[PDB]
Design an enzyme around this catalytic site. Structure first.
Site, PDB file in Angstrom:
ATOM      1  CG  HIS B 121     -41.950 124.195  49.270  1.00  0.00           C
ATOM      2  ND1 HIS B 121     -42.445 123.110  49.956  1.00  0.00           N
ATOM      3  CD2 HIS B 121     -42.416 125.293  49.919  1.00  0.00           C
ATOM      4  CE1 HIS B 121     -43.186 123.528  50.960  1.00  0.00           C
ATOM      5  NE2 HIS B 121     -43.155 124.848  50.989  1.00  0.00           N
ATOM      6  NE  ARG B 234     -59.883 114.676  77.565  1.00  0.00           N
ATOM      7  CZ  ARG B 234     -59.383 114.404  78.787  1.00  0.00           C
ATOM      8  NH1 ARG B 234     -58.361 113.587  78.939  1.00  0.00           N
ATOM      9  NH2 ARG B 234     -59.907 114.972  79.863  1.00  0.00           N
TER      10      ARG B 234
HETATM   11  N1  LIG Z   1     -50.383 121.301  79.043  1.00  0.00           N
HETATM   12  C1  LIG Z   1     -49.507 120.446  79.634  1.00  0.00           C
HETATM   13  N2  LIG Z   1     -48.288 120.358  79.243  1.00  0.00           N
HETATM   14  C2  LIG Z   1     -47.428 119.509  79.854  1.00  0.00           C
HETATM   15  N3  LIG Z   1     -47.655 118.690  80.898  1.00  0.00           N
HETATM   16  C3  LIG Z   1     -48.921 118.756  81.400  1.00  0.00           C
HETATM   17  C4  LIG Z   1     -49.907 119.624  80.798  1.00  0.00           C
HETATM   18  N4  LIG Z   1     -51.037 119.451  81.479  1.00  0.00           N
HETATM   19  C5  LIG Z   1     -50.905 118.481  82.346  1.00  0.00           C
HETATM   20  N5  LIG Z   1     -49.566 118.084  82.335  1.00  0.00           N
HETATM   21  C6  LIG Z   1     -48.963 117.001  83.117  1.00  0.00           C
HETATM   22  C7  LIG Z   1     -49.395 116.698  84.561  1.00  0.00           C
HETATM   23  C8  LIG Z   1     -49.478 115.181  84.657  1.00  0.00           C
HETATM   24  O1  LIG Z   1     -48.175 114.800  85.043  1.00  0.00           O
HETATM   25  C9  LIG Z   1     -49.728 114.733  83.260  1.00  0.00           C
HETATM   26  C10 LIG Z   1     -51.229 114.426  83.075  1.00  0.00           C
HETATM   27  O2  LIG Z   1     -52.023 115.632  83.219  1.00  0.00           O
HETATM   28  P1  LIG Z   1     -53.461 115.726  82.660  1.00  0.00           P
HETATM   29  O3  LIG Z   1     -53.516 115.216  81.297  1.00  0.00           O
HETATM   30  O4  LIG Z   1     -53.873 117.146  82.974  1.00  0.00           O
HETATM   31  O5  LIG Z   1     -54.133 114.553  83.416  1.00  0.00           O
HETATM   32  P2  LIG Z   1     -55.522 114.502  84.339  1.00  0.00           P
HETATM   33  O6  LIG Z   1     -55.502 113.200  85.096  1.00  0.00           O
HETATM   34  O7  LIG Z   1     -55.664 115.759  85.048  1.00  0.00           O
HETATM   35  O8  LIG Z   1     -56.638 114.533  83.216  1.00  0.00           O
HETATM   36  P3  LIG Z   1     -57.886 113.629  82.816  1.00  0.00           P
HETATM   37  O9  LIG Z   1     -58.053 112.601  83.906  1.00  0.00           O
HETATM   38  O10 LIG Z   1     -59.016 114.578  82.468  1.00  0.00           O
HETATM   39  O11 LIG Z   1     -57.447 112.843  81.595  1.00  0.00           O
HETATM   40  O12 LIG Z   1     -49.344 115.829  82.386  1.00  0.00           O
END
Ligand SMILES: Nc1ncnc2c1ncn2[C@H]1C[C@H](O)[C@@H](COP(=O)(O)OP(=O)(O)OP(=O)(O)O)O1
Ligand SMILES: Nc1ncnc2c1ncn2[C@H]1C[C@H](O)[C@@H](COP(=O)(O)OP(=O)(O)OP(=O)(O)O)O1
Ligand SMILES: Nc1ncnc2c1ncn2[C@H]1C[C@H](O)[C@@H](COP(=O)(O)OP(=O)(O)OP(=O)(O)O)O1
Ligand SMILES: Nc1ncnc2c1ncn2[C@H]1C[C@H](O)[C@@H](COP(=O)(O)OP(=O)(O)OP(=O)(O)O)O1
Ligand SMILES: [Mg+2]
Ligand SMILES: [Mg+2]
Ligand SMILES: [Mg+2]
Ligand SMILES: [Mg+2]
Ligand SMILES: [Mg+2]
Ligand SMILES: [Mg+2]
Ligand SMILES: [Mg+2]
Ligand SMILES: [Mg+2]
Ligand SMILES: [Mg+2]
Ligand code: NA
Ligand code: NA
Ligand code: NA
Ligand code: NA
Ligand code: NI
Lengths: 468, 481, 481, 480
Positions: B121, B234
């Site tokens: 395809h 990330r």
């Molecule tokens: N795998 C996921 N799927 C969906 N939502 C998530 C997931 N993990 C974390 N979240 C949510 C929680 C928070 O509302 C938002 C940011 O979480 P996260 O990225 O884990 O930030 P963090 O502040 O813990 O990380 P860092 O400071 O290392 O960047 O996303």
């Protein structure tokens, strides 16, 4: 032959009794896989790819949900397993009469191709049901599961098309009157067919459904109204019922009567008309039918689906050239062009049998300023659209009966006054849209002047100038 | 003229640049309205009525979302408006080559009708895109919006099919390598086509999507990996990427490889094969093609859609009788019957050229059970299904690079043991399904005994219901007890 | 101190600029975690557990979405990154002034506890924002990201409460007039606060709505209307705008004004009133405040949340006994009983200063029936509810301007009759609900006779169950038959 | 009679009047003030939902499953009495939860009352008993055909398991399957999970991929080793592996979020600092503490998430240290994440070793120029067990299945019969380390101690290991 489970995106996992499976697995029912629910609306809302088949499953399911709920709350109604199966069959089969592109066929094509005939999708459904039953040996299977075909076929057809001409029904007696308000409710329009299409159409269109049929089912009860057992709603839920018809009207405004979806429907109809002498559909005894005559033989009608569009589109015969060229213009998006819109004043309604005279009236109007181009009747399309709450000028809530928490067996009425001063004061209106098949800038300018003059001659509303 | 807004149920109101509208509004693109995304899956999941058309709009949309997001977070990548439009056009056009019933056509029909040819395809999409551009005067419209057609056509095709023969691409130079990872990612399988079909198939199947593409986009960046610019995720998000391929595998298991959906596809294919010598499709110069040769002429292929099924079903020509009768049996639901399912044990994997020998092997098995009816090779269908994470035997997460919050432009690798012990140890397998074309209760009983015996003879896995379907055969095999 | 990503169930992954994070991470903003969006509605709709905090994040996000969209489509508006941040801060902070149980506090409690004062949650938000800025060192962070605090604080407050004092705003000049229509639109009610709560309240209540804010944003532009720049909508969208206010009214009817949610709010208010002499809240300089005076000191108000309900419920102080007993009755669901509902006929609006006379009127009605039990004025609650389209008697769509696609710089008006004949003829009304504090079967029977008689005496609408609850009273009134 | 409640997850639910009488009590309404996900609301702003609404959902689903089994298999003789008892148990199984749900029984009680063995299940039985006796529920049970002596025992057994050969007293062996609905100790498949998968997803902003309705449609009761058990259709085995994969996902993404966990840790530390000084009045006016309120259900009735705000808003100088912790949470001055590792193999750190781990990290000897020197009390070490609900075991080995051709015949299905792409283990541990000193030099040093400790105990390479500790990762050739 055991229960079959089917996973539907709207209703989840639905159970089908083996008799219903036997009905579904026939050419006459499977046909509905090849007919789009919304016809030309798919060419506007690309999610609206869904077919009448899956809608019919949903209608059958909901019909079963309502009858079961009434039976569980009110064992004194003596709803039998036979009654339940009959109601499910009627819900499943009430869309069997739809033709290519659904409402395009009965709303636009047949009135133009066969002006003498009085065809409705409901009558088509009864004819198709009968053909389904008789061609697939369903009567002895009905007997095997405790149905009595003489009475029960009559009941199923009556639930689809209404009384087949005092208590006017023959399929069930007056003490089961409420059973006739589930699949197609002719008294007030509240039935399971709407409930499925509100949820299903929304899921595919990308517009969210705001009516909750489940809630309605939980609150429905049967009470005696003027010596007849009827489905009544809880008094408190009156506002939700006004909202249900408001939702239907919304869906019409946003989607079903979209000005482009309608012109696409019109162009498809014009292509079918041009192709009608040349597409052949074989029916009973090897006799040949046309698109417009296939309604006269259910064997041929069984094979009349949205495929006809692609048969025309992919044809090479020079006799199909004009028809094929219309459809090709749809693909290039070279559409017949919107000229404008008006409404009749008052409670005036242009009736169906005046539709075909309107293009000649627009073309015969004698405009404001002299014109370079002259247009003819066949250069105009005049699309008349009725927007209403399903009962012409009537408020459908005047035809609903209610019960109160303190006397759940006593039916009452509720007037509009008692509900809310923010509700509509009228329940029907008509919009008239004009389009021109000549798309150059001079033709369109002239078409607009004919249109505006026509509006003034008919005392219609002065068109919004809109674009230009 | 202008930008169009389209309301899609999955993505909402999406913008289509006027060049994209010009591409959409052609017979070559509108064709995709008449090809079901999931083919025979609609005959099992009645919600799965969606067509390749609306999927393609979604892929184009998502391609645009990822490239715009990379450009907004990293202006130093120098992503231009030209690049963005090229990436959107490739996403929109990557499904142009699909045939009737989508995967049935290239996965089952063409391999059986034209065993000598090597059709995909993807190649179809490139050929159809070329035909779309040349038949509809698209090159001057491309110029009008700042594209350079010769170079940008090459780029778009490369994004669809891969390198068209050290940096192997001609459409863009090495410093825009990351642009080739959006529409079809050959290095690790992470691309926007999957993201659309995860969301869209779920919405219509009635199964819920567990992957969040928007989150992935928020965390995606471009970094230098072994002297090449690549889209990196990330570090923290590595678990979500394992879950994304787990979701793909799930959708395959639940829906795309449904045992009845597959048998319906097989029966449709058998009908097309029987019809192939009789249906004529007109192509370029008035030349006539068949269903199996329409792939060699884009004018003919333009008119090859799911309509062919209804052409066969509604035909009256007596030469189409055998093909029509197969499709009629589909309508009556008189389908070939499922016998069972097994897998090879170890690392042996059954190759395509051994498929035709399998029905004879099942029929030649010698079950030690009382059998009235005797079945032949032609009474059995043996369907071999490859389930993997999109890179054959490989773990696709070993081909992704990651960045850390403390050094967002520095790419690293993450091994599977750094993430979790609960993850798969293997990334590819095969399922073998057997069906019987004789449908009566005695035939099916016998077919089950031949089946289970064959599994035991070949050292395949014990069927799940093996003790119920073949109680007298399963005790022979000491591995199973 | 880079962009933080937050996952919200309504909007998905939202980005917060580091200045917004600095504002969020303060006691004055985090307080909104402890105030329920829908107050007593949680005791009716068990999904409605959501707090003002998450709503505020959503409002800030949407404010940013609308302002960004206008700036991208119309660079000539000269929308700066500074303007965007100020609009986001205003959206984020416009709910800061809410009190315990949200609308219960400013709609029921404060009017009864402090009848002399004129308190609104909007004024509260301005006072709380000022306290937030000054207690947390926000001004130097504002400067660091290019804000000019003197001008920008004024702008943010103005966007919340309106003109603080010919162009009446001081925060921005007339050429940025349209910026004041995003967070709180006093001219026609179309603002981003509604858009968030429509979506969020529906998600939690278990009711769906059909308004699409994203569609509205795609079709919004700024145009000159009567020498002022205003946010206008595409002509085609007029129907959707009528539907948007229909949706608001629906949510009011179904949820916000639920007859039991309102009686629960009334009982909670009565408990707070009984507790008000005895609960102490410490504020600035260790000074003591009451529930009703905490609005006069933002340090005290910072600590006034839904917790007050549980402080009362769990108390042992004998002076809190009457208040605590009310809340205990709520837990047992021994609620005041609903008697019925009516509406004034005509353009009789019952005014606030007549509310206290209504229970006495019901009790003084003379029903003409055998009544064993006698009820008093203090046994009746009369709740008067004003339902409207947000501009009292006015049609808010008369205050929106629209543009046609071919003349996007010309805004015009569209009248109601040009849209549809099925639209409302009136835009405001009142509902009157009556409840009885005596809950036994005989008391309630009597309460219903008083109620229905009172309706007939006042020429109010016939109650819906009127013929079942008062069969001897409804035939007297010829209007009702 | 029947009350209708609109729930966002399940839609309009019917509650029998006996259940309404149970719900409308202080002991049940308490669950309105306990967050399902505890400190997870401070990370996922949608996760405002409380144990109350979850409990309604559990009761509803318990009713759905038992009704479905009874309708398809009238030979099981499921009575209306059985149905009501199963619904009451589903409704009441979360009554024993404490402030912030799992924080209370998972972190706080083990630290405050190390001698006691408390679970939310035992709490639920105690609270149920108190609810029944304080609100006159036994005569209402009789009015609707329950036999309270037998049926209270049955309900409690469904929550906590056998209360002391067929070990249950509430129902005999021929209704064995009834004990697999509300809390299934044999394989973990029960309606409590099904509710929280759907509800937590709805509020978190993560989509649920498990279909409980489908499972109910395919569930049947069959005889397994002379006991009637709930069995699944053979074909559905893949969905069951996916169900536990979804649970593990929710743990990884949300329940065990590294910031959510540190917030829970800080809340717990605040409660511990407040525990000598907060008074909760219970039976007979006796005073209890946060840690002793579990011993008196009148006091426990009043122990909810409110305690956080009581501490936060306090002025008492004895609450100063506790209040200061909570204030730091509001300013988002949280203890800082240093990194994450896993033990190698099936090595598992046990609960009684938790408190010794900060001293091990601090005693590591990094081989780097360090100006700052950290102590045991500067480190938090959070040990997290991720598994399929049966420690090292595959829960699908404890499920029984039926085939379409013999729906009364139960069989077993092994992992190798299903797929080679399935997990090779069913349990692991994650170890997270955090530092209480938040400045840039302290955190740099904490990372070197951490990565050294990992190398000393052969633990997994931290994901960002080469960026956080570029001079430490070269030791270990497995990592390079
Ligand atoms: N795998 C996921 N799927 C969906 N939502 C998530 C997931 N993990 C974390 N979240 C949510 C929680 C928070 O509302 C938002 C940011 O979480 P996260 O990225 O884990 O930030 P963090 O502040 O813990 O990380 P860092 O400071 O290392 O960047 O996303
Ligand atoms: N895992 C799944 N999740 C959700 N829907 C599914 C899944 N598997 C199949 N479906 C859908 C497809 C159908 O619409 C419906 C029934 O399919 P399935 O149970 O596979 O029936 P079947 O007829 O193939 O099985 P059998 O005859 O063996 O019982 O459920
Ligand atoms: N009210 C609505 N809500 C949601 N979707 C709508 C609504 N009206 C139309 N749509 C859908 C159909 C299309 O996919 C998309 C664009 O349609 P629409 O805005 O009607 O544009 P249009 O092209 O017909 O008019 P124009 O060219 O005048 O802007 O939105
Ligand atoms: N219009 C509606 N749509 C959806 N949910 C609703 C609607 N109105 C009320 N609810 C919710 C709130 C509750 O969770 C549940 C039951 O409410 P409702 O039927 O108003 O009960 P009620 O107890 O107030 O009425 P009554 O006692 O008069 O029957 O439905
Ligand atoms: Mg089957
Ligand atoms: Mg209908
Ligand atoms: Mg209609
Ligand atoms: Mg348009
Ligand atoms: Mg791919
Ligand atoms: Mg695939
Ligand atoms: Mg962070
Ligand atoms: Mg009630
Ligand atoms: Mg447990
Ligand atoms: Na009817
Ligand atoms: Na404003
Ligand atoms: Na209210
Ligand atoms: Na149990
Ligand atoms: Ni919610």
């Amino acid at each position: 032959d055991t229960m079959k489970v089917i996973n539907d995106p709207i209703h989840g996992h639905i159970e089908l009794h083996p008799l219903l499976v036997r009905i579904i697995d026939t050419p006459q029912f499977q046909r509905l896989r090849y007919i789009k629910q919304l016809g030309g609306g798919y060419y506007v809302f690309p999610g609206a790819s869904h077919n009448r088949f899956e809608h019919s499953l949903g209608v059958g399911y909901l019909a079963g949900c309502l009858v079961h709920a009434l039976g569980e709350k009110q064992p004194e109604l003596q709803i039998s397993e036979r009654d339940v199966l009959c109601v499910q069959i009627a819900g499943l089969c009430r869309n069997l009469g739809h033709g290519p592109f659904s409402h395009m066929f009965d709303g636009r094509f047949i009135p133009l191709a066969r002006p003498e005939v009085k065809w409705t999708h409901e009558q088509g459904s009864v004819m198709m049901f009968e053909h389904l039953i008789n061609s697939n040996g369903i009567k002895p299977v009905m007997e095997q599961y405790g149905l009595i075909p003489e009475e029960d076929i009559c009941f199923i057809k009556e639930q689809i098309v209404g009384p087949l001409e005092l208590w006017p029904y023959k399929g069930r007696p007056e003490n089961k009157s409420f059973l006739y308000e589930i699949v197609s409710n002719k008294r007030n329009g509240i039935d399971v067919d709407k409930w499925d299409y509100f949820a299903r159409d929304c899921h595919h269109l990308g517009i969210q459904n705001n009516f909750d049929y489940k809630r309605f089912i939980k609150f429905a009860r049967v009470c005696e109204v003027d010596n007849e057992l009827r489905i009544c709603a809880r008094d408190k839920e009156v506002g939700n019922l006004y909202d249900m018809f408001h939702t239907r009207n919304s869906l019409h405004r946003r989607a079903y009567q979209h000005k482009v979806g309608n012109i696409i429907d019109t162009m498809i109809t014009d292509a079918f008309l041009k192709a009608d002498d040349y597409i052949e559909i074989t029916g009973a005894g090897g006799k040949k039918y046309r698109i417009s005559t296939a309604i006269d033989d259910m064997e041929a009608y069984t094979k009349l689906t949205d495929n006809i569009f692609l048969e025309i589109l992919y044809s090479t015969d020079p006799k199909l050239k004009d028809a094929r060229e219309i459809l090709k213009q749809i693909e290039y998006r070279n559409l017949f062009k919107y000229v404008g819109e008006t409404q009749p004043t008052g409670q005036i309604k242009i009736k169906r049998e005046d539709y075909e005279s309107l293009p000649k009236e627009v073309a015969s109007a004698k405009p404001k300023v002299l014109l370079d181009v002259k247009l003819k009747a066949e250069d105009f399309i005049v699309d008349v659209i009725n927007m209403d709450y399903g009962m012409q000028e009537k408020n459908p809530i005047d035809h609903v009966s209610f019960y109160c928490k303190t006397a759940p067996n006593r039916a009452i009425r509720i007037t509009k006054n008692q509900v809310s001063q923010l509700l509509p004061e009228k329940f029907a209106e008509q919009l008239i849209r004009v389009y021109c098949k000549k798309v150059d800038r001079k033709s369109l300018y002239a078409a607009r002047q004919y249109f505006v003059q026509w509006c003034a001659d008919r005392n219609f509303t002065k068109p919004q100038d809109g674009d230009v």
